[PDB]
């Protein structure tokens, strides 16, 4: 049922506004501090595969792409990436962007799927910003299906608070008549469940976003 | 360091790298590297191409070889000023941008070590230049060159990639390259130090020859 309404929420009215926020366009202060919390947690993860040495050729799944703010980097850097979402407006403008940026070059393959069928074996398994829209119970069963696509490394993000959401959910039971934090404990047991050991760890934190960030290698 | 590298592109580096830079047959390696240089240099003008606004674009070509980037910029309406420390290139360039370019929109070619350089430009672009320097002084080049772009500076380098890393490995395994690689994150830092942030990127990867391309921009 929370598949369903993240999908339509993303192919509609979160389809314009998230395709602002992770676009170059013209946003008020809330929505800019989004861009630039998530462009770090974007720039963090690049930096991480380019200072390997080894991203060219890499064979990479960026899962829940959205707009391809990952895929597109990566694939500039060399990456084999492939790109996939839920919503089929995502992955639209993910390929469209990707085509007025990359042209005929190197370039990532986007299709639109929910993560939880994808299929394939990859070295680097790429999971952002996707997790704070499913319960600890489900997220243990998404991570579980990419683990098992990743031959060497996954690397996801998620948030550990959520104020704001928090916030409104308070409010909420206050008048007559959303997100979800994990925890880390819990996203480092389930990677452990699946035989993954936590590599490198980082954290993004501006006034409106907050993603820890984990790279998670098989043992 | 920079009476080594330019008595070296003077003489016995002029007359290599004038054939690999040129039309003419080579051996197997040294194809491999004008393919890949070729690459390079084709990634930069799609670049400037595709924004529209080349014609008439003050440019900056520092350590300009033999003119291999200078001359399809001034073919596109480009006013380029191109210089290299070996005045060999220097001529060689002058002689083929007259020789395919005539008397028309055509670049002005100076000997100038690029530390040295002058005034001010839209783009100041160094291509497969930083390979001869130590990260030390190559930071010191960078934000010279920064403190003449106006808007844009474009660099190559030899990143920390596995093709290299697997030559040396071998190497390492006799008795017994002065070519300086250096970290993206190094670079990029180097980069916001001088007030720029980073927006298109690239990568070369050939056989033999391996080149990070970075557009930096002033925020
Ligand atoms: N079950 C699922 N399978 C694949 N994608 C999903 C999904 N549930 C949500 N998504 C997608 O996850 C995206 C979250 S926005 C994050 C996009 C991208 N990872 C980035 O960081 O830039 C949305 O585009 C949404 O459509
Ligand atoms: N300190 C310096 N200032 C200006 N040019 C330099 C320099 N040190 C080396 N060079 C020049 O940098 C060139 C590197 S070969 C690269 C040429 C050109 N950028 C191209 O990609 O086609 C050589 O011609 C060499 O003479």
Same mark, same amino acid.
């Given at each position: 049922?929370?598949?369903?309404?993240?999908?339509?929420?993303?192919?509609?009215?979160?389809?314009?506004?998230?395709?602002?926020?992770?676009?170059?366009?013209?946003?008020?202060?809330?929505?800019?501090?989004?861009?630039?919390?998530?462009?770090? &947690?974007?720039?963090?993860?690049?930096?991480?595969? /380019?200072?390997?040495?080894? =991203?060219?050729?890499?064979?990479?799944?960026?899962?829940?792409?959205?707009?391809?703010?990952?895929?597109?980097? =990566?694939?500039?850097?060399?990456? =084999? /990436?492939?790109?996939?979402?839920?919503?089929?407006?995502?992955?639209?403008?993910?390929?469209?962007?990707?085509?007025?940026?990359?042209?005929?070059?190197?370039?990532?393959?986007?299709?639109?799927?929910? =993560?939880?069928?994808?299929?394939?074996?990859?070295? &680097? /398994?790429?999971?952002?910003?996707?997790?704070?829209?499913?319960? &600890?119970?489900?997220?243990?069963?998404?991570?579980?299906?990419?683990?098992?696509?990743?031959?060497?490394?996954?690397?996801?993000?998620?948030?550990?608070?959520?104020?704001?959401?928090?916030?409104?959910?308070?409010?909420?039971?206050?008048?007559?008549?959303?997100?979800?934090?994990?925890?880390?404990?819990?996203?480092?047991?389930?990677?452990?469940?699946?035989?993954?050991?936590?590599?490198?760890?980082?954290?993004?934190? &501006?006034?409106?976003?907050?993603?820890?960030?984990?790279?998670? /290698?098989?043992?």
């Amino acid at each position: 049922d929370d598949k369903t309404i993240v999908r339509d929420y993303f192919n509609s009215t979160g389809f314009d506004r998230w395709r602002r926020i992770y676009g170059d366009g013209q946003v008020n202060f809330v929505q800019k501090d989004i861009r630039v919390g998530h462009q770090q &947690t974007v720039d963090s993860v690049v930096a991480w595969l /380019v200072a390997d040495g080894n =991203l060219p050729g890499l064979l990479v799944c960026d899962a829940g792409c959205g707009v391809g703010s990952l895929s597109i980097p =990566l694939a500039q850097a060399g990456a =084999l /990436v492939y790109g996939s979402d839920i919503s089929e407006k995502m992955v639209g403008e993910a390929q469209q962007k990707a085509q007025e940026v990359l042209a005929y070059g190197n370039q990532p393959t986007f299709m639109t799927q929910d =993560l939880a069928q994808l299929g394939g074996k990859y070295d &680097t /398994v790429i999971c952002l910003d996707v997790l704070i829209h499913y319960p &600890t119970e489900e997220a243990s069963a998404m991570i579980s299906h990419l683990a098992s696509l990743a031959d060497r490394r996954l690397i996801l993000s998620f948030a550990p608070k959520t104020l704001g959401l928090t916030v409104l959910k308070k409010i909420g039971g206050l008048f007559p008549g959303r997100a979800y934090q994990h925890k880390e404990a819990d996203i480092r047991k389930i990677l452990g469940d699946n035989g993954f050991s936590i590599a490198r760890t980082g954290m993004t934190s &501006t006034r409106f976003y907050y993603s820890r960030i984990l790279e998670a /290698v098989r043992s």
